[PDB]
Swiss-Prot record, chain A:
Subunit text: Homodimer. The cytoplasmic dynein 1 complex consists of two catalytic heavy chains (HCs) and a number of non-catalytic subunits presented by intermediate chains (ICs), light intermediate chains (LICs) and light chains (LCs); the composition seems to vary in respect to the IC, LIC and LC composition. The heavy chain homodimer serves as a scaffold for the probable homodimeric assembly of the respective non-catalytic subunits. The ICs and LICs bind directly to the HC dimer and dynein LCs assemble on the IC dimer. Interacts with DYNC1LI1; DYNC1LI1 and DYNC1LI2 bind mutually exclusive to DYNC1H1.
Subcellular location: Cytoplasm, Cytoskeleton
Domain notes: Dynein heavy chains probably consist of an N-terminal stem (which binds cargo and interacts with other dynein components), and the head or motor domain. The motor contains six tandemly-linked AAA domains in the head, which form a ring. A stalk-like structure (formed by two of the coiled coil domains) protrudes between AAA 4 and AAA 5 and terminates in a microtubule-binding site. A seventh domain may also contribute to this ring; it is not clear whether the N-terminus or the C-terminus forms this extra domain.
Name under which the protein is recorded: Cytoplasmic dynein 1 heavy chain 1
Residues forming coiled coils: 143-164, 417-440
Full-length numbering of the shown residues: 21 to 483 of 4646
């Protein structure tokens, strides 16, 4: 509120806890001394501790630029290079009138990535206080804990996705030079713009090698693929999605007027197979074409409907929507091997979601009759998943009858994990039935 | 990140530098905080949070319990409890295998369970820096939009159930 902390208060707080929340503890380190001798730290501390609006005293002593640099401010950034220590005030303002450091709470925003540090801090203490307040010590705390756990799982899955990286193209300098020259006036280059650089076979071969290394960068993305059974189906959806993302980005990088212009430079400069040996060496066309092929299949998938929503009706309707997304195979031309691999990964994901639902069922914590009923419900959901797999096999057989000359491998070579889950549920129900049988034996004998 | 699990010595020093921070005016922590940190409870808890794979969160909730000044006893549990009258310092091990001589921030990511309720502290921390962190991170180049939407919804509901009175003002700068 009115506890306006000066530069000396921020200096003492830095010398007492900046190393404990940013380095290997102790007293004022180099970054803590720099924060103690800075006015920006005093301003950010007064705005996030004195003022009741901001509550996170972000001691952004990011270990970079080792010799950390306290880039303390009122805003935040979940970067992979900002090892901040946000002293989030427990109250609306960290009033130093009370115990100077106890006015807030350390929240070490580590050097992990956005999804990485997000899932880390979220799964570390977000859902904990909300769930502990919902159960221990009403319509908002439990749902808040559920949303915090969902955010932790979402950032984790984002980090655990099959995300596609970025690959660039190194442009030759004379291209850029003459390009700037044309940008001086209102002009774009041409073949005769370079004068006789198109007649410089050395320079022509320099750009030939440039075009070559650019297709090498292309090739780094063309052959980049992954089996649909690798990991989970969720990773395959994120995989193909980020694939198309980077495909279009690198595609536009290729489609820049300088690259195409240099192709014109070469071919009109008698290096007659620039676009020939260039376009033929590109798999980008076929890769984007393949994403267009598998476009409705990767779309509308019930990933979060089952993974993020592991409830009973959520997994049932999730498997129904997964079968509906699988029904788009008539519009996606999924390869029988790719479909079988993706079905295996989908069954593995169904088994993991069934495991989460089983953990959310608590047959052991419930009675033997209740354990058998919960096992019957889990086995019924597993039977519905196997029925969805049966409908998928029916559609696979329809695709087999369609492309019998080429695609007729609908042998249903996908491990139905729902059957194993239902069998294990039957084993648990058998243990519960033995418990009920012994209870009836005690009530009779 | 390091097989040298933080035992009662490393956790005791971490409590003497963190429970003192998130539970007092820096310097030295409370007597119950260092006593529980040096005890076998926090020894096994920190050793599991820095040695076991499934155990990675070490919430040393330095709860300012009454009937003792408020004794900020560092209950080193796994998850953060219901922060009401607690001066909790949930310095959860940033890595499932934390160190003993490395940086405390890189090995034990701090967090807490503030004295405010779950909705109040959730809205406070969320609107204070969770929106800006992910905001600038996504702005500096999708699951991030869904996570940001769920975060905004959580902050909105936390602000709704946070203050039942809710008498704000509108300034015109």
């Amino acid at each position: 509120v009115q506890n306006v902390a000066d530069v000396s208060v921020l200096q003492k707080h830095l010398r007492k806890l900046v190393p404990l929340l940013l380095e290997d503890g102790g007293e004022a380190p180099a970054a803590l001394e720099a924060a103690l001798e800075e006015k920006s730290a005093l301003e950010q501390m007064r705005k996030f501790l004195s003022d009741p609006q901001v509550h996170t005293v972000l001691v952004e002593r990011s270990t970079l630029k080792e010799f950390i640099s306290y880039n303390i401010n009122i805003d935040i950034h979940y970067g992979v290079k900002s090892n901040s220590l946000a002293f989030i005030k427990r109250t609306p303002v960290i009033d130093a009138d009370k115990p100077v450091s106890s006015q807030l709470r350390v929240l070490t925003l580590s050097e992990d990535s956005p999804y990485e540090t997000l899932h880390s801090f979220i799964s570390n203490a977000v859902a904990p206080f909300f769930k502990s307040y919902i159960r221990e010590s009403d319509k908002m705390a439990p749902s808040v804990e559920k949303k915090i756990a969902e955010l932790e799982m979402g950032l984790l899955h984002l980090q655990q996705n099959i995300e596609i990286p970025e690959i660039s193209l190194p442009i030759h300098p004379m291209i850029t030079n003459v390009a700037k020259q044309c940008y001086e006036r209102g002009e774009k280059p041409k073949v005769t713009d370079f004068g006789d650089k198109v007649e410089d076979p050395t320079f022509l071969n320099q750009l030939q090698s440039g075009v070559n290394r650019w297709i090498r960068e292309i090739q780094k993305v063309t052959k980049l693929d992954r089996d649909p059974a690798s990991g989970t189906a969720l990773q395959e959806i994120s995989f193909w999605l980020n694939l198309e993302r980077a495909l279009y980005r690198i595609q536009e990088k290729r489609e820049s007027p300088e690259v195409l212009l240099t192709l014109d430079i070469l071919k009109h400069g008698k290096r007659f197979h620039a676009t020939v040996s260039f376009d033929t060496d590109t798999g980008l066309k076929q890769a984007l074409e393949t994403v267009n092929d598998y476009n409705p299949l990767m779309k509308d998938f019930p990933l979060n409907d089952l993974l993020s929503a592991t409830e009973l009706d959520k997994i049932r309707q999730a498997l129904v929507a997964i079968f509906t997304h699988l029904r788009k195979i008539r519009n996606t031309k999924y390869p029988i091997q790719r479909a079988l691999r993706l079905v295996e990964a989908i069954s593995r994901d169904l088994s993991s979601q069934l495991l989460k639902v089983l953990g959310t069922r608590k047959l052991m914590h419930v009675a033997y009759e209740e354990f058998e009923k919960v096992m019957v419900a889990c086995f019924e959901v597993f039977q519905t998943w196997d029925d969805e797999y049966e409908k998928l096999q029916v559609l696979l057989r329809d695709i087999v009858k369609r492309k019998r000359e080429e695609n007729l491998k609908m042998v249903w070579r996908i491990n139905p994990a729902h059957r194993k889950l239902q069998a294990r549920l039957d084993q648990m129900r058998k243990f519960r039935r033995q418990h009920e049988q012994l209870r009836a034996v005690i009530v009779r004998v | 990140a390091v097989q040298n699990v933080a035992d009662v010595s490393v956790l005791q020093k971490h409590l003497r530098k963190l429970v003192p921070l998130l539970l007092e005016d820096g310097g030295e922590a409370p007597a119950a905080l260092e006593a529980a940190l040096e005890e076998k409870s926090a020894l096994e808890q920190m050793r599991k949070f820095l040695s076991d794979p499934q155990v990675h969160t070490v919430l040393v909730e330095r709860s300012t319990l009454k009937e003792d000044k408020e004794f900020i006893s560092y209950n080193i549990n796994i998850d953060i409890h219901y922060g009401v009258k607690s001066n909790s310092l949930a310095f959860i091990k940033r890595t499932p295998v934390i160190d003993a001589d490395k940086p405390v921030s890189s090995q034990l990511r701090v967090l807490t369970l503030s004295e405010d309720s779950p909705y109040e502290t959730l809205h406070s921390f969320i609107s204070n820096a969770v929106a800006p962190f992910f905001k600038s991170y996504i702005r500096e180049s999708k699951m991030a939009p869904s996570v940001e939407k769920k975060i905004a919804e959580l902050e909105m509901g936390l602000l709704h159930l946070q203050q039942n009175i809710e008498i704000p003002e509108i300034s015109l700068p």
